[PDB]
Design an enzyme around this catalytic site. Structure first.
Site, mmCIF file in Angstrom:
data_model
loop_
_atom_site.group_PDB
_atom_site.id
_atom_site.type_symbol
_atom_site.label_atom_id
_atom_site.label_comp_id
_atom_site.label_asym_id
_atom_site.label_seq_id
_atom_site.Cartn_x
_atom_site.Cartn_y
_atom_site.Cartn_z
ATOM 1 N N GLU A 191 46.536 12.025 49.443
ATOM 2 C CA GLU A 191 46.682 13.145 48.505
ATOM 3 C C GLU A 191 47.303 12.717 47.182
ATOM 4 O O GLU A 191 48.351 12.071 47.151
ATOM 5 C CB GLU A 191 47.506 14.296 49.097
ATOM 6 C CG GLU A 191 47.572 15.481 48.135
ATOM 7 C CD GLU A 191 48.276 16.698 48.685
ATOM 8 O OE1 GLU A 191 48.665 16.703 49.869
ATOM 9 O OE2 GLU A 191 48.446 17.657 47.894
ATOM 10 N N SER A 234 45.563 19.990 44.448
ATOM 11 C CA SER A 234 45.578 18.907 45.412
ATOM 12 C C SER A 234 44.231 18.200 45.340
ATOM 13 O O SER A 234 43.185 18.838 45.315
ATOM 14 C CB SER A 234 45.856 19.429 46.824
ATOM 15 O OG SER A 234 44.896 20.385 47.219
#
EC number: 2.4.2.-
Length: 201
Positions: free
Chosen positions: A170, A130
């Site tokens: 993200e 991530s």
């Protein structure tokens, strides 16, 4: 050159534009949502098994495989810089409790050792990675910032819109990725290690 967003409105606009073009299936969307809800736990099992998912439960294998395959549709249209914050244990168990001085600065000797360990080396991550398009408070207090150089055409998905468990701006990267550590430096106030790495697939 790699695009580094310095304005959150531009970053959000760009990410949303990518997201609207992915054409994800219902099941792929569901797999990504499920991943965001269980991200830390799933990444742990991937690490223990060194990316081998054959022994996982049937439902878990299907989720992981859908997620893996969804990256076929999620590629960056340009060279881009992505950001990640990490805690000392990211550098190894030997750094967990030794990287920092009590005054909040990176211990310069520990930094020297971290640089010797990792500079000009390749690193393989068994979990998914991530990242964010920007460093905008979600990595507050983290002593290590990694800047990933991700080439045009690389698998990378803007999933901020998909789920309430996705991080701000993200960008998710596929599991079993290798990156090369190009540079390691200290921040000007001495409180962070800044790592620059080039993403491979």
């Amino acid at each position: 050159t790699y695009q580094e967003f310095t304005n959150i409105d531009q970053a959000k606009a760009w990410g949303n534009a990518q997201y609207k073009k992915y054409g994800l299936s219902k099941s792929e969307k569901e797999a990504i949502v499920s991943y965001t809800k269980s991200a830390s736990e799933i990444n742990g099992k991937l690490r223990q098994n060194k990316g081998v998912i054959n022994g996982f439960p049937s439902n878990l294998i299907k989720q992981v495989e859908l997620l893996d395959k969804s990256f076929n549709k999620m590629k960056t249209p340009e060279n881009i810089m992505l950001f990640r914050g990490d805690d000392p244990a990211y550098l190894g168990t030997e750094f967990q409790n030794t990287l920092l001085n009590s005054n909040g600065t990176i211990n310069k000797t520990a930094f020297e050792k971290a640089k010797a360990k990792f500079l000009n080396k390749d690193r393989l991550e068994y979990g998914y990675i991530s990242t964010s398009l920007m460093n905008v408070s979600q990595f507050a207090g983290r002593p290590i910032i990694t800047k990933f150089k991700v080439a045009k055409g690389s698998k990378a998905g803007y999933i901020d819109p998909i789920s309430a468990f996705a991080g701000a701006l993200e960008m998710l990267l596929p599991r079993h990725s290798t990156y090369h550590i190009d540079d390691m430096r200290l921040s000007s106030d001495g409180k962070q290690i800044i790592i620059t790495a080039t993403m491979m697939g």
